[PDB]
């Protein structure tokens, strides 16, 4: 596992002409808690 950029706790990947929302990276496992376990199927478009 790499280090966070000096002076930072995380990285934000800002989204090209898009409807895309952000992605994020932490370099310490302690900086996330798995609050909810979601069980699901993807649904075939009609």
């Amino acid at each position: 596992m790499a280090h966070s950029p000096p002076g930072h706790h995380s990285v934000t990947g800002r989204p090209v002409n898009g409807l895309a929302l952000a992605e994020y990276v932490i370099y310490r496992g302690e900086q996330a808690y798995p609050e909810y376990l979601i069980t699901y199927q993807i649904m075939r478009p009609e």
Partner: protein
């Protein structure tokens, strides 16, 4: 005896409903046309469980306070999706360096998405791997998938365009 218990939420519970809405409302179309995560506009939610672990919760709040104090009392805490073949190990033992994406665009760390459909591309591995274990189908509409909806401390975040 990891210390982890799972509590089922009723579909009638406001907490179930707000988590489902964040899951459904953050689906988008992907540039791979569904190659990694499958072709879909929405999910069938089968179950939502609260993950309860005193030790792992205290591990989180201890680190949250360290970050907060380095950042004018601001944890910059988000609720974000995580998809992984290792969700079972994560809920029992917590996130650690073994859940890191070594080949990630933003370096070897643990990745989270605002888009549920982005995290869905990783449930069966990097780029969807070989898809569902039963049918080897990245777009399987039969097999049950799991995503984590996670509390994440960002603190001071480096903005990469």
């Amino acid at each position: 005896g990891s210390g982890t218990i799972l509590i089922d939420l009723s579909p009638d519970d406001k907490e179930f409903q707000s988590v489902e809405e964040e899951m459904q409302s953050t689906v988008r179309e992907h540039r791979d046309g569904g190659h990694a995560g499958g072709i879909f506009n929405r999910y069938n939610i089968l179950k939502i469980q609260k993950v309860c672990n005193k030790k792992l919760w205290e591990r989180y709040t201890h680190r949250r306070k360290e970050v907060s104090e380095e950042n004018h009392n601001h944890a910059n805490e988000r609720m974000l999706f995580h998809g992984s073949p290792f969700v079972n190990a994560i809920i029992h033992k917590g996130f650690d360096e073994r859940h890191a994406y070594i080949g990630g665009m933003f370096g070897a760390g643990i990745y989270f998405a605002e888009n549920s459909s982005k995290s869905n591309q990783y449930v069966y591995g990097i780029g969807g791997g070989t898809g569902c274990p039963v049918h080897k189908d990245r777009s399987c509409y039969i097999c049950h998938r799991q995503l984590l909806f996670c509390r994440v401390t960002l603190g001071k975040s480096f903005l990469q365009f």
